[PDB]
Amino acid sequence: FDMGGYFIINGSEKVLIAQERSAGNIVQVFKKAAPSPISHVAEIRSALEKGSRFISTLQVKLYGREGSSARTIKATLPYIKQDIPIVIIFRALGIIPDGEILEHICYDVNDWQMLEMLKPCVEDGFVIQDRETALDFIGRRGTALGIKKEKRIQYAKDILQKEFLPHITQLEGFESRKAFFLGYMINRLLLCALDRKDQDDRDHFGKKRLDLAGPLLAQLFKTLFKKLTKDIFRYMQRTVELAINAKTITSGLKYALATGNWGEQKKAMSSRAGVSQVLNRYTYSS
Amino acid sequence: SLMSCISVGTDPMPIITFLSEWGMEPLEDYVPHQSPDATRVFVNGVWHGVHRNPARLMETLRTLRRKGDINPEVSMIRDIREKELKIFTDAGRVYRPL
């Protein structure tokens, strides 16, 4: 009758409790409250399926309140302090003339209502007029800064490549793919702002993923396998000219599954506890 | 619930390959004012491009899964109103048989 689906860690029956989470790579609009400068926000929690897993989140913000003069759209970029006006990002992506920028956001040449809302953004991003001066403007605002003209322009390049909208591509030449998506976010932002679509339900089960025993283990294993990688480097360096610690993998797995503390290690909090528990055996149904 | 399961996590590539070979304009080539009402296609919140006749496309993808060719744990939705076709190869999605 015993079903399995549990582990045996130091003689005890440990269960990995399924952990709920908000799904990644999903565009959602939320009306930011009454006493805020920002009125609406387009969020996207973008992470790679596997590969260090970047928890970098893009915030496309609609500044100004309902009935306030000059409502501008600014975006917060990973490893960039200030909120960049959308236009500059498009220009930094190579999409230089307003109208070609407007083509990416508003899909209908008829819809004047949405376009009237985009006029201020154009007015904001007017100062920057080429791809070069756009990457310098983003490069100027760090990070910190990292003073040197050639340096800052060279950076914003990397941030947009590696950090900005990291799903889709982390690769080089994909400026068009990323720019059409940014436009899709701004479209989804204004659709909600013009009372055409609803504010996203942060309580919809479809926008939630339950991490089971497998992925939970993978998160732990990756943390540990990369910890073995740094030890391999330490032995290779010391060998100024086959002893690679198997304990680290065994112990770490054994630790987390035993303690329920889904982290590293006896030096836990903030890590994640209560994940692994002892299997109830009062009743078969229990 | 007794009938519920969780998506194990499949590979997107055979679907991405399939979509392009079934009438999909790549986002790089898209021109919003030329092809206007083209239903925009997504595979795990990654915009891959557009398709001019989604009615045909939705039917081909639906019948691929129903036959077994597309993995059965893969979810695909067609919002006609918003003009979107979203597909999920994603791991962690709770599903139920019907």
Binding site: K50, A213, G214, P215, L217, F225, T229, I232 | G9
Partner: peptide
């Protein structure tokens, strides 16, 4: 979920950024 981890996911983690100035081939589970 566990089976998916052992059969597939384990081989992914083993060689995603593995290689060191020493690379890692196929993984075997006893």
């Amino acid at each position: 979920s566990f089976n998916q981890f052992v059969d597939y996911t384990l081989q992914d983690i083993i060689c995603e950024d593995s290689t060191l100035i020493i690379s890692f081939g196929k993984i075997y589970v006893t």
